[PDB]
From a paper:
Hydroxysteroid 17-beta-dehydrogenase 13 (HSD17B13) is a hepatic lipid droplet-associated enzyme that is upregulated in patients with non-alcoholic fatty liver disease. Here we report crystal structures of full length HSD17B13 in complex with its NAD+ cofactor, and with lipid/detergent molecules and small molecule inhibitors from two distinct series in the ligand binding pocket. The overall structure of each HSD17B13 subunit could be divided into two parts: (i) the catalytic core domain (residues 29–259) that contained the cofactor binding site and the catalytic center and (ii) the membrane anchoring domain that consisted of the N-terminal helix (N2-P28) which was highly hydrophobic and a C-terminal proximal helix-turn-helix motif (P260-N286) which formed an amphipathic patch on the protein surface.
We could remove compound 1 from these crystals by soaking with buffer containing NAD+ only and obtained NAD+ bound dog HSD17B13 crystals (apo Dog WT or apo hereafter). The nicotinamide nucleotide of NAD+ interacts with the putative catalytic triad of HSD17B13 (S172, Y185, and K189)23 and a long loop in HSD17B13, loop P218-T239. The adenine nucleotide of NAD+ forms hydrogen bonds with side chain of D67 and D93, and the main chain of C94. A prominent feature of the apo HSD17B13 structure is that the putative substrate-binding site is completely blocked by the C-terminal peptide beyond the helix-turn-helix motif. This peptide, N286-K300 (C terminus), interacted extensively with the long loop P218-T239. When a steroid molecule was docked in the active sites of the apo dog and human HSD17B13 by homology modeling, the molecule would clash with the C-terminal peptide and loop P218-239. In fact, repeated soaking with substrate β-estradiol failed to result in ligand binding. First, filling the pocket with the C-terminal peptide stabilizes HSD17B13. The apo HSD17B13 has essentially the same structure in different crystals, thus it may closely resemble the protein on the surface of the lipid-droplet in the absence of inhibitors.
Author numbering:
A (entry chain A), B (entry chain B): 2 to 298
Amino acid sequence: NIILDLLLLLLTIIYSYLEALVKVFFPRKRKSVAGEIVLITGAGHGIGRWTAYEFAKQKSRLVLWDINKHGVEETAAECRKLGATVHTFVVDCGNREDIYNSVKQVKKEVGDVTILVNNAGTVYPADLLSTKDEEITKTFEINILGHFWITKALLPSMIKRNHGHIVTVASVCGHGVIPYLIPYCSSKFAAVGFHRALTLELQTLGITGIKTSCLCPVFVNTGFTKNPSTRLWPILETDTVARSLIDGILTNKKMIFVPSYYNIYLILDKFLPERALAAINHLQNIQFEAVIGHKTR
Amino acid sequence: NIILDLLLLLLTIIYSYLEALVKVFFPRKRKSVAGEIVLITGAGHGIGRWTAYEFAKQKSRLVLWDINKHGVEETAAECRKLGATVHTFVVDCGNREDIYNSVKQVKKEVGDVTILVNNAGTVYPADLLSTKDEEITKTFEINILGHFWITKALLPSMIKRNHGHIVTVASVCGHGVIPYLIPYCSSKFAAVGFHRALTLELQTLGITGIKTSCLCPVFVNTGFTKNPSTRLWPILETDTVARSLIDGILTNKKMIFVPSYYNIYLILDKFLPERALAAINHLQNIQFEAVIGHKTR
Ligand SMILES: NC(=O)c1ccc[n+]([C@@H]2O[C@H](COP(=O)([O-])OP(=O)(O)OC[C@H]3O[C@@H](n4cnc5c(N)ncnc54)[C@H](O)[C@@H]3O)[C@@H](O)[C@H]2O)c1
Ligand SMILES: NC(=O)c1ccc[n+]([C@@H]2O[C@H](COP(=O)([O-])OP(=O)(O)OC[C@H]3O[C@@H](n4cnc5c(N)ncnc54)[C@H](O)[C@@H]3O)[C@@H](O)[C@H]2O)c1
């Protein structure tokens, strides 16, 4: 228990050092994204906002989508200070009709998107019996169904030119699960499944030019969940996540975990017995605001 | 290419007789389901139909749901020949309003469901750009969102009595992916995520009496997909799947793969490099009717 803690800390330290060593010994080649038309959904705040900043520094043409007009204009203002050409659109990324109508505007005013970042997301932390049905559907409408509509609208051009990049922002909740997040984990598993099946179908059809990347961070300090706490995982800073994402996109990395040492916990979750996984679970002590038993705890 | 077939044939034969050895050395205790109120969705045909037959032989009280009244009555007729008490209801298991209204009828006419089998499902095989948006939503409405509505309606009683069993019929498509099945794989990943997060939340809340099982089969000969063909996996007969499901429920098995040796391919998909996975993929030669490039291939 105390020694399990130290074991997990030493493995975390070994992974961190060894990965940093491989990044100097065998570095992956970075591609250029200058001049690419990058569409980022949920770009009005958090991961989407700081990912837009990274693409502005990379010299890409930006198309930012969000339901929050004020936020998306604040992001665009900063991207323009970084020297980027930005187009903002107020779009509900859970509404199919809104998505298709807005893609028509993007083609007319900007052109054909070459990099798509499906970042927009929502969460309503509560135990299954404290969830509202409307909140469950909204979670799927934004976290996964929106990915289908945007990808179907933007893929035709990418296939024609044999050139594109589809980034799916999922979560470690798309590989592992957390209590009081059943609809969220369910929708994030669907996002991982979509990325994996889209990657394979493109391979099967012989489409060599369209790359895919899946972003899977642990808790990030954006306010997405109120006051998160994990003993074994870090509460990430937004800029760190955006930096890891841009590094992964530029090197065509398919599955980007943040921090990369989450892979150790991923392997433990597949081979460890139930008793061992419950011991790690208690040590983790996950905390965050949620509605438990119809009361916000 | 050549030795690769017998390399996988060996890992299949070895698993088959090591599992049979563990079933004698460390046997799992089978529980009784006699007198339990078992609700099976999609019980009008295939896996749901033959699972109803297995529960009829187990002496449970059956509640069968399906959109096909003729088919669900044909299943009930056979369960009654097996000596079981069966109640049939025509329910759209993708329609939330229909689900809640029907749960009110089940409580009034039958009582409180203790075993829930979420089996109803749908598939529209096509490449992403040949899919219809209506087909994508229908896949999620039945394959995952219906699980949320039925489980939320039936869980309160199970928690009050600290006694229940939630069975999620997912697929190997909820762990691995197959091209031309992006919405299907995505919705099956969401079903696996729901089972895993439901299992953890019940554990976290101290609910010791509610068990969870997840049925993940390879292709089953039900007509669900047209003329399926797999070289390394068998095309399972429906009765085999129903037998494996009943054996897993009676021993409280959380993840039931059919055949159980799919676990070898599951581990190969996590540790083998891209080159080796594409070599096994070609050897697999998965075939089934699907709309490819707006043409039925
Ligand atoms: N924050 C975390 O702890 C965390 C961890 C893992 C994964 N993620 C994922 O990262 C993504 C971004 O989360 P974040 O932490 O940056 O959140 P955030 O709250 O900082 O920002 C999310 C943004 O998405 C926008 N958005 C919400 N619904 C939308 C809709 N219907 N249409 C358009 N835009 C919409 C919001 O307006 C907001 O600007 C999400 O997909 C989330 O699930 C977050
Ligand atoms: N057959 C396979 O190859 C296969 C493989 C893996 C997983 N599965 C899964 O097993 C489950 C059952 O498949 P099957 O092969 O037995 O199919 P099937 O087509 O033989 O039977 C499915 C049944 O579900 C019913 N159903 C469909 N939509 C419904 C709805 N809205 N409400 C109520 N009932 C509904 C149908 O009327 C039918 O009786 C599905 O979830 C499927 O995804 C099947």
